[PDB]
Design a protein around this ligand. Structure first.
Ligand SMILES: CC(C)(C)OC(=O)N[C@H](C(=O)NO)c1ccc(Br)cc1
Ligand SMILES: [Mg+2]
Ligand SMILES: [Zn+2]
Length: 889
C-alpha cells in the first residue's frame, strides 16, 4: 500500500503537450485510441516512462508509430504501464495506444460509465487513467482534441470539452463529433457525454466584454421539464461572480448535464459540468423544498470552479482545499446573497459543528491540507471542504470586503492560467493585509497554521467590568487538544467578531470590532463602557472553534431575544440547550447506573421557555430562525461534549426536554401551525418554476417542524391536521405527513398513499425512501426489510442505496439498538456495496465515525463490525484504508 507524502512533491520527468483521443462506443465495449505528443522535461534523469492505466485491455501500444512488445520493452500490471528507459526517446516523441474499456459494467462510476441510457465520464481525481494511459496528475497540463463516435439512434447528443469542430455520419447507423479544446488543462477536467439528451438553453451576455455565452442544461427526455430552476441558478451564478468578484465567463458555451448515477453532487469539467440528477433537477410538484437550495448551491459551486479550480489550477492533490474550500466559500457568499435568509449561514454552521467537528475529534482527523494519503478519494472530506471554507472565509472577516476583494484579485491576476498552492493564496491575502494595516511589516505567516494543524480549537472567555472606571475587559484563551498529527499544538490566528450589548435596552455599545487573537491568551480592554455589557462573541461564527462563552443562562436569554447577530442568538440558544442536556443526561445516567427506584430531574429553565414563546409570537421574527430555536442541537453536535455516550440515555434526555417545553408551548405551536398556513402554502407561483421564495419555504419548514413536535406529543386531534396536510400539493408537506404519522395508526395508509404519489418520478421516489428510512417507527427494521424487497432490491444506484440506509442511521434509539443489529445491517450493506462502488461504500461508513465516543458496549459492537469488514478478502483499497485509519490500526 503506497503512501504519498506532501513533502515529496517532484515535477515529472516528462511532458504531455497534446492529447488526441478517439472514443468509439459500441454495444458491448468501448474502444479508446489515444496519441500523446510528449517531450522530456528538465527534471528527467533517464527514468522509465511510467503511465497510469487502470483496468485497461491493451490492443496495442506504440512509440513513434512502432509497436512495443510486451515483456521485452514494457510491462503492464493493470495499474501501471512501464516502458523501460532504453526504449524511451530523448527528445519529442509520440506515444499511442488502443485500449478496450467497458462503460456498461462500470458500476464504480469512475472513468467512463453508463448511467441508465447515458454514457458519461467522471475523472476527478484518478478516473482519467481508467479511460486511457496517462501521467494522471493535475500538474500535467495538455491540449485536447477529442473525437467521439456512437450509434446515432441511441446516442444522438455527443459532448466533450471545447468547441465542436466537426460532425459526421458513419456507416452502420453511427455518427461522430470532434471537439477541440486548445487551452491547457489537467486530465481530471476532461469529460465526455453521449446520450439521447434533451435541453433547455439561454444566452448570457457578460457584464464587461459583452461576450455572448450559450447556456445549455441537459437531462433525459422524461425529466426535461425539471431543468428550469437549474438554468436560472446558472444565470444567477454568472451574475454574482461578475458583481462581487468582477469575473466573467471566458468560454462561448457552458453545458450542465444531469445523470441518474453519480457518486457526489456534481463535477466542474471545463465547459461541461456533470451533475447528480438530485442536484440539478426539480419541479414544484415533484421535489421537496430542500432541492431548490441544493441546486442553487451545486450549480453555483461548479460555476465558481471555473476560476477557482479550472483557470487557477492545483499543483498537486494536497492543495485540494485551495480549490474546494475556496469554491465552497464563494458558493456560500453567493447563496447568502441569493436567499437573503439568516438560515443559510446558520445551516452551514450547523453542519460544520456537527459533522465536521465530529470528524475533527475522530481518529480520521486531518488538517485541511493533509500530509499524506493512500487513496485520494478518501480526502474529499467535510474537513477539506467545510472547514476549508471557514478558513477561506476568515480572510474576508480579517480584511473586510474591500481589502478581501483586493487580495482575491491579486490571487487571480497572478496565478490565472497557472498551478498554485495554498501558500500562493496566503501570499495574496498577506499583500492585502499589509495594505489594510498600512505597513509592509505585517504578515500572515501564523495564519498558515490553519492549513497544517488538525483539530478544533477551544476558545474560552472571562470578563471584568469596573463600573467606576467605565472599563470592560474580555480575557480570551485558546487551546487545541493534541492528537496524532501534532503533539504540540501552536496558537492560531483567530479573528473574533464581537459586539457589546447594553442589557438595559438591547443596544450596541461599540462599533463593529474584530479582535485578533494571535497568542495562547490575551486581554482586550474597552474604555468608556457606560454599563456592564453582555458580550456578543464570534458574530457570524467568525472562526471554526468550540466557543465557551461563560455566560449565565440569563445573559444568554437576553442575547437570544435582543442581540443583532443571528449566529450569536442561535448559539446562545444552543448553549442553553447544551447546559440542560448535559445536566439531564448525567441525572438519567446516574439513575440507570445506580438502579434508582426514584430520582429527580432538573426542569428546563422557565425563563428560557418564556423567551422561546416571546420569539415565536413575534410576527416580525424570522420563520427560519424560529424553526431552529424549537429544535434541540443535533445528536452529532451533542456527542462532541459527552464521553462514553449512552445513546439510550441521550434519547431519554431529549425526550424529557422536548416534553418539558411542549407541556408549556404546545398550544402556541398549534396556533402558529394554523396561522402560518395561508402564507406558507400559497399556490400563486406553484406553476412558475423560476419563482423561488426562500422565506416561504422557511415558513413551511417551521410548520413541518411544529407539526412533528405536536404529533410526537399526541396533541389533541392533531391526526386531523396530519391527514389534511397529506393532501397538500407540496411534497415537503405531504412527505412530512408520512413521517409525523409514524406516531399514529394511519402510518401505513399514508405510506401507501405517498408511495403512489412518489413512484413515477425517480428523484421523488428517492425522497420518499429517505422519509420512510427516517420515520420514527418501533418496527423500522421490518420496514427497512420491506423497502429492500419491494423497492430497492439489487439497485446499484448510489442515490437509492443512500436514501434507504443513511437516514435510518440517524435514528438514535433504533440504529444504536444494544443488540448491535443496526451496526450489523449497515456493515452488511457497506461490504455489499464495496464490491462494485468503493467510494459509496466509504460514504456508508459514516455512522461508524463516532465509534470511540460511545459507551463501552456499543464501542465493542461497532469495532467488531468494522474488524469484520476489514477481514473481507475482497475489500477495496479505498475501504481498507478508511477503516484502518478509523480503527487506529
Ligand atoms: C458541491 C459539493 C460541495 C456538494 O460537492 C460535490 O458535489 N462534488 C464535489 C465537488 O467538489 N464538485 O465540484 C466532488 C467532486 C469530485 C470528487 Br472525486 C469528490 C467531490
Ligand atoms: Mg433508477
Ligand atoms: Zn468542488
Amino acid at each position: 500500500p503506497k503512501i504519498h507524502y506532501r513533502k515529496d512533491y517532484k515535477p515529472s520527468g516528462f511532458i504531455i503537450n497534446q492529447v488526441t483521443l478517439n472514443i468509439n462506443i459500441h454495444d458491448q465495449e468501448t474502444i479508446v485510441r489515444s496519441v500523446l505528443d510528449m517531450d522530456i522535461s528538465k527534471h528527467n534523469v533517464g527514468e522509465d516512462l511510467v503511465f497510469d492505466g487502470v483496468g485497461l485491455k491493451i490492443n496495442e501500444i506504440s512509440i513513434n508509430n512502432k509497436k512495443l512488445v510486451e515483456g521485452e520493452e514494457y510491462t503492464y500490471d493493470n495499474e501501471f504501464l512501464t516502458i523501460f528507459s532504453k526504449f524511451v526517446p530523448k527528445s519529442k516523441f509520440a506515444f499511442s495506444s488502443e485500449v478496450i474499456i467497458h462503460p456498461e459494467t462500470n458500476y464504480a462510476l469512475t472513468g467512463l460509465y453508463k448511467s441508465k441510457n447515458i454514457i458519461v465520464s467522471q475523472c476527478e481525481a484518478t478516473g482519467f487513467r481508467r479511460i486511457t494511459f496517462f501521467i494522471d496528475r493535475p500538474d500535467m497540463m495538455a491540449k485536447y482534441d477529442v473525437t467521439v463516435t456512437a450509434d446515432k439512434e441511441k446516442y444522438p447528443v455527443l459532448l466533450s470539452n471545447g468547441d465542436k469542430v466537426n460532425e459526421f455520419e458513419i456507416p452502420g447507423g453511427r455518427h461522430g463529433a470532434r471537439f477541440n479544446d486548445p487551452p491547457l488543462k489537467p486530465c481530471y477536467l476532461f469529460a465526455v457525454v453521449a446520450g439521447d439528451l434533451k435541453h433547455l438553453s439561454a444566452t448570457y451576455i457578460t457584464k464587461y466584454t459583452k461576450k455572448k455565452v450559450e447556456l445549455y442544461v441537459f437531462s433525459e427526455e422524461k425529466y426535461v421539464s425539471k431543468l428550469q430552476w437549474a438554468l436560472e441558478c446558472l444565470k444567477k451564478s454568472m451574475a454574482f461572480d461578475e458583481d462581487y468578484f468582477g469575473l466573467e465567463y471566458d468560454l462561448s458555451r457552458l453545458n450542465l448535464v444531469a445523470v441518474s448515477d453519480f457518486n457526489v453532487g456534481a463535477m466542474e469539467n471545463k465547459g461541461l459540468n456533470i451533475f447528480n440528477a438530485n442536484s440539478l433537477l426539480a419541479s414544484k410538484k415533484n421535489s421537496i423544498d430542500f432541492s431548490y437550495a441544493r441546486i442553487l448551491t451545486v450549480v453555483g459551486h461548479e460555476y465558481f470552479h471555473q476560476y477557482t479550480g479550472n483557470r487557477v489550477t492545483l499543483r498537486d492533490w494536497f492543495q485540494l482545499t485551495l480549490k474546494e474550500g475556496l469554491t465552497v466559500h464563494r458558493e456560500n457568499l453567493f447563496s447568502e446573497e441569493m436567499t437573503k435568509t439568516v438560515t443559510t449561514r446558520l445551516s452551514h454552521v450547523d453542519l460544520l459543528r456537527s459533522v465536521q467537528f465530529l470528524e475533527d475529534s475522530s481518529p480520521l482527523s486531518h488538517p485541511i491540507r493533509p500530509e499524506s494519503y493512500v487513496s485520494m478519494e478518501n480526502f474529499y472530506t467535510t474537513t477539506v471542504y467545510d472547514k476549508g471554507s471557514e478558513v477561506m472565509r476568515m480572510y474576508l472577516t480579517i480584511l473586510g470586503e474591500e481589502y478581501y476583494k483586493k487580495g482575491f484579485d491579486i490571487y487571480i491576476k497572478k496565478n490565472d492560467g497557472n498551478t498554485a498552492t495554498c501558500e500562493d493564496f496566503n501570499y495574496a491575502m498577506e499583500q492585502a493585509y499589509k495594505m489594510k494595516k498600512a505597513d509592509n511589516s505585517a504578515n500572515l505567516n501564523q495564519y498558515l497554521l490553519w492549513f497544517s494543524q488538525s483539530g478544533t480549537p477551544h476558545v474560552s472567555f472571562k470578563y471584568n467590568y469596573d463600573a467606576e472606571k467605565k472599563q470592560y475587559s474580555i480575557h480570551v484563551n485558546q487551546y487545541t487538544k493534541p492528537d496524532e498529527n501534532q503533539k504540540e499544538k501552536k496558537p492560531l490566528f483567530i479573528p473574533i467578531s464581537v459586539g457589546l450589548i447594553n442589557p438595559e435596552n438591547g443596544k450596541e455599545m461599540i462599533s463593529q470590532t474584530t479582535l485578533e487573537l494571535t497568542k495562547e491568551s490575551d486581554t482586550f480592554v474597552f474604555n468608556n463602557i457606560a454599563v456592564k455589557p453582555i458580550p456578543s462573541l464570534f458574530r457570524g461564527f467568525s472562526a471554526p472553534v468550540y466557543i465557551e462563552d461563560q455566560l449565565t443562562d440569563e445573559e444568554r436569554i437576553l442575547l437570544l431575544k435582543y442581540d443583532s447577530d443571528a449566529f450569536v442568538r442561535y448559539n446562545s440558544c444552543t448553549n442553553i440547550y447544551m447546559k440542560q442536556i448535559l445536566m439531564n443526561y448525567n441525572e438519567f445516567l446516574k439513575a440507570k447506573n445506580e438502579k434508582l427506584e426514584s430520582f429527580q430531574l432538573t426542569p428546563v429553565n422557565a425563563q428560557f421557555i418564556d423567551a422561546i414563546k416571546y420569539l415565536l409570537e413575534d410576527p416580525h421574527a424570522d420563520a427560519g430562525f424560529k424553526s431552529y430555536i424549537v429544535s434541540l442541537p443535533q445528536d452529532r453536535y451533542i456527542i462532541n461534549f459527552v464521553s462514553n455516550l449512552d445513546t439510550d440515555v441521550l434519547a431519554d434526555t431529549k425526550e424529557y426536554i422536548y416534553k418539558q417545553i411542549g407541556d408549556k408551548l404546545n398550544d402556541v405551536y398549534y396556533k402558529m401551525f394554523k396561522s402560518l398556513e395561508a402564507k406558507a402554502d400559497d399556490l400563486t407561483y406553484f406553476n412558475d418554476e423560476s419563482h423561488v421564495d426562500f422565506d416561504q419555504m422557511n415558513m413551511r419548514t417551521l410548520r413541518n417542524t411544529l407539526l412533528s413536535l405536536l404529533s410526537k406529543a399526541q396533541y389533541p386531534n392533531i391526526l386531523n391536521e396530519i391527514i389534511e396536510h397529506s393532501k397538500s400539493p407540496y411534497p415537503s408537506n405531504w412527505l412530512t405527513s408520512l413521517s409525523v404519522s409514524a406516531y399514529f395508526d394511519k402510518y401505513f395508509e399514508l405510506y401507501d398513499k405517498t408511495y403512489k404519489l412518489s413512484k413515477d418520478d425517480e428523484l421523488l421516489l428517492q425522497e420518499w425512501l429517505k422519509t420512510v428510512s427516517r420515520s420514527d417507527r418501533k418496527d423500522i427494521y421490518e420496514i427497512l426489510k420491506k423497502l429492500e424487497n419491494e423497492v430497492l432490491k439489487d439497485s446499484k444506484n448510489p442515490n437509492d442505496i443512500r436514501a434507504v440506509y443513511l437516514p435510518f442511521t440517524n435514528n438514535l434509539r433504533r440504529f444504536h439498538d444494544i443488540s448491535g443489529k443496526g451496526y450489523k445491517l449497515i456493515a452488511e450493506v457497506i461490504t455489499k456495496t464495496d464490491k462494485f462502488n468503493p467510494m459509496v461504500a466509504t460514504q456508508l461508513c459514516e455512522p461508524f465515525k463516532l465509534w470511540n465516543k460511545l459507551d463501552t458496549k456499543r464501542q465493542e459492537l461497532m469495532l467488531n463490525e468494522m474488524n469484520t469488514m476489514l477481514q473481507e478478502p475482497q475489500i477495496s483499497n479505498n475501504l481498507k484504508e478508511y477503516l484502518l485509519r478509523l480503527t487506529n490500526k
